[PDB]
From a paper:
The cellular role of DNPH1 is to remove hydroxymethyl deoxyuridine monophosphate (hmdUMP) from the nucleotide pool. Hydrolysis generates deoxyribose monophosphate (dRP) and hydroxymethyl uracil (hmU) products. Glycosidic bond cleavage is driven by a conserved catalytic triad and proceeds via a two-step mechanism involving formation and subsequent disruption of a covalent glycosyl-enzyme intermediate. Each DNPH1 monomer adopts a Rossmann-like fold consisting of five core β-strands surrounded by five major α-helices.
In the first, an inactivating E104Q mutation permits binding of the intact substrate without cleavage. The purified protein (referred to as DNPH1E104Q) was co-crystallised with hmdUMP at 4 °C and X-ray diffraction data were collected from a single crystal. The six protein chains found in the asymmetric unit present as two full biologically active homodimers and two half homodimers; corresponding partners to the latter are defined by crystallographic symmetry. All copies are bound to substrate and are remarkably similar to each other (RMSD between Cα atom pairs = 0.128–0.406 Å), although there is some disorder for amino acids ~60–70, which form a loop across the top of the active site binding pocket. The core catalytic triad, consisting of Y24, D80 and E104Q, sits below the plane of the substrate deoxyribose sugar, poised for nucleophilic attack at the anomeric carbon. The base, which is held in plane by hydrophobic interactions from I29 and I76 side chains, adopts an anti conformation, with chi torsion angles (defined by O4′-C1′-N1-C2) of −178.9°, or 174.5 to 179.6°. The phosphate group is strongly coordinated by S98 and S128′, the latter being donated by the helical extension (amino acids 128′–133′) from the adjacent subunit. The same extension additionally positions the substrate hydroxymethyl group through a backbone amide interaction. At the other end of the substrate, the inactivating E104Q mutation introduces an amine group that forms an additional hydrogen bond with D80, pulling both catalytic residues away from the sugar. An additional interaction is observed between a base carbonyl oxygen (O2) and the sidechain of H56, which sits on the helical element immediately upstream of the shielding loop.
Author numbering:
A (entry chain A): 18 to 68, 71 to 162
B (entry chain B): 19 to 161
Amino acid sequence: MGRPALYFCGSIRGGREDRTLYERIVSRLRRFGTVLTEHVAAAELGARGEEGGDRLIHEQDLEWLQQADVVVAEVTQPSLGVGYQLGRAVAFNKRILCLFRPQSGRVLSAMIRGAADGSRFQVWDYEEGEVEALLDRYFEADP
Amino acid sequence: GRPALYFCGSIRGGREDRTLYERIVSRLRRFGTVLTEHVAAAELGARGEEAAGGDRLIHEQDLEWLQQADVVVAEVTQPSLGVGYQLGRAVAFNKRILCLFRPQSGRVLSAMIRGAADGSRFQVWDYEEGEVEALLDRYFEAD
Ligand SMILES: O=c1[nH]c(=O)n([C@H]2C[C@H](O)[C@@H](COP(=O)(O)O)O2)cc1CO
Ligand SMILES: O=c1[nH]c(=O)n([C@H]2C[C@H](O)[C@@H](COP(=O)(O)O)O2)cc1CO
């Protein structure tokens, strides 16, 4: 193995607008580790949980979060679950990268933007076309 | 002294439910001090144009209040990264937590919030707008 465990977060029931970007992010993360949460980018997944109970979703996810070496979150779409994941991840002292798209026209949550602290919690603005180059930079410097 | 109460509600995730946040915060004052009462301000927008100095100040002040809180109450109908983040940090602090969700919104509540419920220290209650005060009364007779 020897692969870093990568834990990806992205809105599901908060909205699936950014699913194609999640796919691109997951695809590139695979270059630098094993993505525990590839399901978040699945095209079939809907925003009404139509594809086990939520308790199982929560418990399995928290198990993966505690395995993770790095947490990567696309935080452009407001999502309770993505925020919740990042909260638990901070409490676990996980290394965290958050990716936000200003082109969305939104202003990113101050609880995420304001959580940026040192190298362990970073928040990067990006345009859709540079997502792979930014993930390379991030993981080439801090694998 | 008086219980310290920590209310969570979407700001930059959208202010659609602001009137309900005002009703929740107002009723919560019957049971203690609402540390995060600013979340209910009617004039508050979703773009952070009201505060200067950066989001780091908001994150740090909030976490200070969260650590002071005796009870956490979150209205989780509007998807919000910040509300989710607050609940994640609060779960890590093992805070007593009540979330209130409105199924009449047409949304399906995040599995990370719904699935975080253990029926005791983390409770998630469905409600309709008219009864929010009655439910807060029902929760704080015991809390
Ligand atoms: O079915 C699910 N499976 C799942 O793993 N999640 C996790 C992974 C995502 O990063 C995050 C999305 O939360 P939300 O659905 O509130 O937008 O929660 C969320 C859901 C539905 O909330
Ligand atoms: O200016 C702010 N002040 C503030 O206290 N918050 C906290 C309290 C709210 O319960 C929660 C709302 O998060 P959000 O803005 O991402 O929807 O975060 C959030 C913001 C803006 O994100």
